[PDB]
UniProtKB/Swiss-Prot annotation:
Monomer. Homodimer. Interacts with PPARG. It comes from Homo sapiens. Lipid transport protein in adipocytes. Binds both long chain fatty acids and retinoic acid. Delivers long-chain fatty acids and retinoic acid to their cognate receptors in the nucleus. This is Fatty acid-binding protein, adipocyte. Keywords: Acetylation, Cytoplasm, Lipid-binding, Nucleus, Phosphoprotein, Transport. A motif (Nuclear localization signal) lies at residues 23-33. Its main location: cytoplasm. GO terms for molecular function: fatty acid binding; hormone receptor binding; long-chain fatty acid binding; long-chain fatty acid transmembrane transporter activity.
Length: 133
């Protein structure tokens, strides 16, 4: 029951500062433009200890499955090869990606009827708000 309130299909309804976040991460111009246009659906499911998060968009479909606290290798939508660990901290899913001596953190939180995604790279934060599909 660890992630019950996250489970479901979620659609992006607003974004702030995502271009800047992508710049800070090192994403190039053409990928930023196409990726920034996307309105993904985020599909979260749980089977036993295994959490699966899919992102489906016109840019790039991704899928990760993981156990909390157990590092895994992830190829991101922008084609970074990262080492990821996802933990629950006070009811927030905290997803850390490490690559090339860099780190970024994506937090997913349930707030009211929304799922709020906060993406941080150094001093740059992007906030993306999803609603149930
Ligand atoms: C971080 C993030 C938040 C989200 O809510 N949806 S998303 O856009 O698929 N995404 C992954 C991502 C997509 C594209 C790029 Cl270019 C980068 Cl760096 C990351």
């Amino acid at each position: 029951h660890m992630c019950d309130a996250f489970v479901g299909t979620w659609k992006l309804v607003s974004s702030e500062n995502f271009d800047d976040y992508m710049k800070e991460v090192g994403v190039g111009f053409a990928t930023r433009k196409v990726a920034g246009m996307a309105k993904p659906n985020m599909i979260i499911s749980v089977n036993g200890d295994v959490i699966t998060i899919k992102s489906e968009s016109t840019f790039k479909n991704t899928e990760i499955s993981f156990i909390l606290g157990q590092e895994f290798d992830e190829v991101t939508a922008d084609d970074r090869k990262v080492k990821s660990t996802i933990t629950l901290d006070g009811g927030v899913l905290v997803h850390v990606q490490k690559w090339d001596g860099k780190s970024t953190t994506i937090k997913r939180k349930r707030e009211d009827d929304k799922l709020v995604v906060e993406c941080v790279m150094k001093g740059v934060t992007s906030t993306r708000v999803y609603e149930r599909a």
